[PDB]
Design an enzyme around this catalytic site. Sequence first.
Site, PDB file in Angstrom:
ATOM      1  N   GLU A 355       4.067  62.931 -29.479  1.00 14.14           N
ATOM      2  CA  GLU A 355       3.564  64.244 -29.871  1.00 14.14           C
ATOM      3  C   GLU A 355       4.307  64.784 -31.084  1.00 14.14           C
ATOM      4  OE1 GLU A 355       1.085  66.238 -28.550  1.00 14.14           O
ATOM      5  OE2 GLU A 355       0.419  64.470 -27.432  1.00 14.14           O
ATOM      6  N   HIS A 485     -18.554  59.394 -24.565  1.00 10.59           N
ATOM      7  CA  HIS A 485     -18.730  59.521 -26.005  1.00 10.59           C
ATOM      8  C   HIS A 485     -20.187  59.420 -26.421  1.00 10.59           C
ATOM      9  CE1 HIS A 485     -14.382  59.126 -27.201  1.00 10.59           C
ATOM     10  NE2 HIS A 485     -14.346  58.777 -25.929  1.00 10.59           N
TER      11      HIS A 485
END
EC number: 3.4.17.23
Lengths: 711, 711, 183, 183
Positions: A355, A485
């Site tokens: 991150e 998706h």
Amino acid sequence: IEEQAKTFLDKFNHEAEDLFYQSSLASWNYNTNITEENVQNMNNAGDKWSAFLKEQSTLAQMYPLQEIQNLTVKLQLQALQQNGSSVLSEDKSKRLNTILNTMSTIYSTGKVCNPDNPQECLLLEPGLNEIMANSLDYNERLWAWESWRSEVGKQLRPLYEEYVVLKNEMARANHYEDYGDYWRGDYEVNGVDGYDYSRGQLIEDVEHTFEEIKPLYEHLHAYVRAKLMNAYPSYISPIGCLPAHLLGDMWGRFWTNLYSLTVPFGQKPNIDVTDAMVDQAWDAQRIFKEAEKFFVSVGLPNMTQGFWENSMLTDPGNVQKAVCHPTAWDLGKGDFRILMCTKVTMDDFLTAHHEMGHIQYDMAYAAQPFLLRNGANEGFHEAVGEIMSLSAATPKHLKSIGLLSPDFQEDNETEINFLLKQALTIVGTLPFTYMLEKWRWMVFKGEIPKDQWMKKWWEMKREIVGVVEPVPHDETYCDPASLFHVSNDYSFIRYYTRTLYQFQFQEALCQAAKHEGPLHKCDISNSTEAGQKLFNMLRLGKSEPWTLALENVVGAKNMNVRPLLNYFEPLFTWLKDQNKNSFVGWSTDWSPYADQSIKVRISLKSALGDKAYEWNDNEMYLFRSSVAYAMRQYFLKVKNQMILFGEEDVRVANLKPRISFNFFVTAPKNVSDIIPRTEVEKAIRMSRSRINDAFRLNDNSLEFLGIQPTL
Amino acid sequence: IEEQAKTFLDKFNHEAEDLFYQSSLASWNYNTNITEENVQNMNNAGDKWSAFLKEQSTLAQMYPLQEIQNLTVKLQLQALQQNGSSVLSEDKSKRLNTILNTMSTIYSTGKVCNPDNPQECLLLEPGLNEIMANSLDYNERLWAWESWRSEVGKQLRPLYEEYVVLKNEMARANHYEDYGDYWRGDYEVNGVDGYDYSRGQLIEDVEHTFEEIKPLYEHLHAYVRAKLMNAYPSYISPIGCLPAHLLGDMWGRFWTNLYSLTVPFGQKPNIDVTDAMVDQAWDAQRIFKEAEKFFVSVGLPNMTQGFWENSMLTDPGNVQKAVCHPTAWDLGKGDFRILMCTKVTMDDFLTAHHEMGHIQYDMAYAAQPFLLRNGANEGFHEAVGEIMSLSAATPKHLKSIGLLSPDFQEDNETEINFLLKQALTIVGTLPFTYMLEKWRWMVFKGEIPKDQWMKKWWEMKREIVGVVEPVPHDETYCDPASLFHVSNDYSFIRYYTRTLYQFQFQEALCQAAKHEGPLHKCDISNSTEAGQKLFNMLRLGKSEPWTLALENVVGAKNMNVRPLLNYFEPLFTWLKDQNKNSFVGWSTDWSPYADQSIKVRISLKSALGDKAYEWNDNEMYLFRSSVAYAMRQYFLKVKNQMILFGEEDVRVANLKPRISFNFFVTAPKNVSDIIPRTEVEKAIRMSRSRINDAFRLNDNSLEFLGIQPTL
Amino acid sequence: CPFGEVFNATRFASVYAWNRKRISNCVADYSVLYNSASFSTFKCYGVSPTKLNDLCFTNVYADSFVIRGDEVRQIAPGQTGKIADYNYKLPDDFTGCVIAWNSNNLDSKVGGNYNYLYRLFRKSNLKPFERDISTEIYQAGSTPCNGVEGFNCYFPLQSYGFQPTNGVGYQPYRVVVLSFELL
Amino acid sequence: CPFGEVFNATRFASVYAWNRKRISNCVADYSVLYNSASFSTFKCYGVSPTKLNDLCFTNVYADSFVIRGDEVRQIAPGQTGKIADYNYKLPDDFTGCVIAWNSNNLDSKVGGNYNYLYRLFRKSNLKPFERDISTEIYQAGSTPCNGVEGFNCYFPLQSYGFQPTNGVGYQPYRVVVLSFELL
């Protein structure tokens, strides 16, 4: 003239900053603390930004583009002059939005319930994923894999069939040929004189770089099959494909849940420093401090001193509604934050590095104009983040920070364990991605009609990936629309290019730090040339063509595959030895149900002369119902049972123009049960005259291959 | 000898008091305040009482009963010497308990969802009752009435089919012939020499007292039909029955929701003192005080001074989990309580009287031995409670207490309004009760096989009640098992005898208070002879035969019906006038679907000689599938549409031994749609040769009545 | 001479208009300043540190305003930038010396501060030690605009916006300069 | 003479065994009693109200115990009942007079009080002013029982049970009687 464009941009850059800042602050304040006034405080701020952006977009069209020679303002205007979906009629936009919302909700809240006890229904996320990722029972997995599609996929067929058309219109109104050629518009540059790239070249690059991964994928496939032949005996042939419901989840995207069945040495646990993080009393802060120190070591800046108090590093004490999905936030105006609920495991120890990579990337191009603060393309932002977590979890770095005692040594069996656990996740998802994107492109451009979708799908599945279905799916299902998706309208090609950029970057950086051993033990800590090479590329952003930014690190112009193969060599030279006896490859003719089926062949002209009716699908309906009635009568008059067969317990496959096909039978409500071939033969011997009379055929026009007439 | 029984009872009476007291205190403490330790504090106390009772029951068998001459100890021992269900084997008891639990949960948590949007399902209590009791749309009501049965009733067929048998065994092991003869064992007495009653006499009394209510029910039925012919035009014939889904709830038990469609004078609102209870500032306490004062007026005692603080009269201030269903509790040892959440309406003003009636009844027989503190039979406890609420809501009493100004006068139109609103609830539920109990008795004793349940049901429905079904139900459904009392194993005859005892008591008491007008304006306040007559019967309990306790009030020995007819006279003399033109009665041949049906007649021998197969239900399956295929082909080749009919869209009725029946067709998933007769005729004219060939019939053996062959 | 006070005020001016304060007839030695704790930038070229104890009391002035953090580079002589040709101009030779310091608690309301403006557009660069306050619509290109402010013409004065969570480079800074001359 | 105290104690005895207290050599006039606020029953037959101011101080006794509310009817002479032939017996002639009063706060624990017992079974009725404390198994019928207590034979002493929520007739009451005689 250019002065006007320059001043227009000078004003837009000053308005967008504040508008975006407030829009993002609203969403942060909502996500940090869920209530019922924050949503109303955030929605209006978002609507304001949307409205301002649309107004300025429609205003910026007053400048003809082909007069500009400064590349920077050219790129900015090109990124602002776009039109989007606001080109159709109004009611067409309404129809499209309604279709998209309906598909989203249908995916989100669908249910399936047990035929035994019909009062207990399960959702997708809690419970169906559990059954599919934990079980070891053939019949339960078959039930779960079949019911999801049979109950939810069908609802999504007549919506997709319109979605396609509408999107195609929206693309052709913008000087694109179709929607796929609209999605391929990111890997495109013009006018650099030596650094060009067209839209049609991406297809050829993908198809030409894929064909060098097959020699490794085949060996991995053969090994996984030879290891599955022990957990499900008498269900897998040693020269066929793999049934589609034994992979590890509802679709087979990742194979990472087969590891428990496929450890090469099950008596040698892998490295896990978790108890050392509770016997040394490590809290949340120390992890992020170590991450910052690692990032400092290579020659990159510190944190901002406003990052330490404004962020939210741990779950609130009171039970407080606050969604927790670890993310990195770039609000604007020199503000950067992180959001996660840090537990104490090595998992979060790696997630912290992954991150913070995004934040270290965002702090680099904050000197560019507003519209040019992104990555070079879709693949850079995640590859740059992941090459850190790759080089943070080695035994060397782990022992240097103080979590592994120096008494720890290395055995090559642990090396093979680690390499295989990584391969099962990296290489297992390239064929699936390639196949899915290829199918979608071919459907969008027009090379597949509306009545061969679910046939080309299951041919490309056996031809490329090597996976077969357990039950024949006709042209009413919709299997590719049961994925997040495809039904939520997202792109899927970035997951293929990121995996190559990652290893390219890694091999390019492990050469400046003077590595000497294998590529998977490499480390970039205590370096100063690698840091400078990386920072010489982070600081560009979108202000340069990506094919030049790629060269400032590696020294080439296109994505390559050989770095990915150099990473997986010590596993290749071991799989090549273990696969000495087995058969390497697969044959596309086997099937898990093609040994209880019967073949039917019909010849109409020979019987009826110039009066033969035509054979549409209503005749197929009649045939199925007739066979069901025959089965009913046989069971009643021989076995003294009363079972209620139907016209949907007769499955049909391989329809051809000279009427001839295969079929088989199944218990009323138990998909994993099959009436054997012998009983069906006996049941059809007994009632053949009536089946013949129903169609006007005479025992020589209607042939069941294998059942010889004697009376 | 008797001394031993007397001493044994002397000990049991002293143990049961405390054990029951603690058992009841636990349940009160749970119901008043719901938590997760109270249930565990209550279940063990209940189990202790159950165990003690079973032990003492099995111990009390050591005394031969036929030696006792004291009636009191005889009754006590008879009530204690019973055996219950602990006479079967062990595994049989386990099977029975499992069946009962499964039926209860299936009724409690069943679901049905819309065919249009299959993601929204509704339960029974919240939502289905709403659709059935509020709507005015024919198609929605038909969908709701059909789907509940079609989805839940079927699940309850194979369980009931065992329940019956098991219960019959449990009855025959106790010297009863069946289960119905076990349920009729409360209206039974022996040895009083002039006050006898057998088990078989109840049936004849019921059947002989019902046949005097038909002249009033017929007029009410005709009036309701003539008033419904305006809210649903072209759906109700003026000489037929009423379709079963237009009554007011899922079954038609009460007709009280048709009042809005059936007011005789819609411009004259009825008496409702609710604003007078908020302009005079009436809180919870004052209502109960007025109730106590009314009860004191007639010559009955006060309250206990422990009733005012221990009870719970209003909902707790904090949002506190505490179920609120207004009940009266007799804990024991001189303790009495009430439980309700008193709002401020006239509704609760009447409910207070109805609930305090039970307490005033319980305070009366507290001087009897422990086992003899009940009502005389099942009908007394509620009739005694309801004759108070009947006489508390008159305009006279309402104006005397101070809620109606003396300026209020009476018009006979309001009288008719009130009388009809009462009739729609009192008389509308007698035929249903009689029919249901008759069907259950006949099924239990054995006069109906397991393949004529749902045929006798729908014949008795048209013959007695006068209600027809909208869609033919074959022998797979189970309609009487979709009611709370049938699937939860309760008795249903008390609801019929209570309604007669009520009006008998009322007419007996309104004669001691010197009434002079009509019976529905009567009042018993400010009386002292009625109170004494009633208290001379309350104080007995079960220590006397009910047929003698009934005589201490009225002066007869059996239940009578004429008091109920004297109550409803001014409505009879008005209905008899309004029904001058219409046809009074109904004919049992009409049907809401018998005008789009076709009749088929088959003759096998004439065609096939001594080779004709036999006609079981598999041939019916084949016929239905063939007709579905014909409809498909016709639509495709004429109307250029693609509709998918099935073998469950063909409904069949009136099967006979010489094969001949009726049928009709229905849209795929819309039960309220019907393909007209003409289109079916055209579709069958076109494909008759194939339907004939499928069966080996020759246009003279297979006759569609109405379709004449021409080619 | 009362500059020990001018460093201690309630509000400053914007950049397109500043205060002109004369100081004379005094004794100041400039040692109590240049040595404190709240300073961040003390940049001097014409006079060395502790060299401003000579004949100085001749026509000295003060002027104070606010900018954001990443702009103080534009003040010094040369160093062309955004606000060096449009709001404030400072020649190369005659600079007394520059002082600046952070002020985030005296300003930057949580909701947003819009009490400060600055010029953006003009037809030519400003000459040394110049000023302007006019507010007329900017004729960009070749088309006559009059009040319309629609297209090719807009207002040249914009607001800043100051929030308490901005970065080190986006926070408000106060600045004052000195002018040392000779008679 | 100290009876003003015996009405004020901590615990009483049961019914199958009570206290025998002698009083003598005193002056008591019996006016402070019979006139109070905590009384509920003052039933006297042998001596009229305010008539017990004569020669009385000759062999007077006290005795105190507890029963439940709906039992005080059995104490008075005659009036056969449950505890009138098995626990306490009182002849018709020689009754001084009876006193009783409620006591629910001195007793009746919320959980349940089992400090009191009473006899239930015996072979014959008690004779005037008798007593018994023996506890042997009750031979009901014709069969020899010895300790078994199984069937036709059980223990004759049982507990009461006192809770704070019982009715007016199920609450504990204390009672004392007087015995007035002549030498």
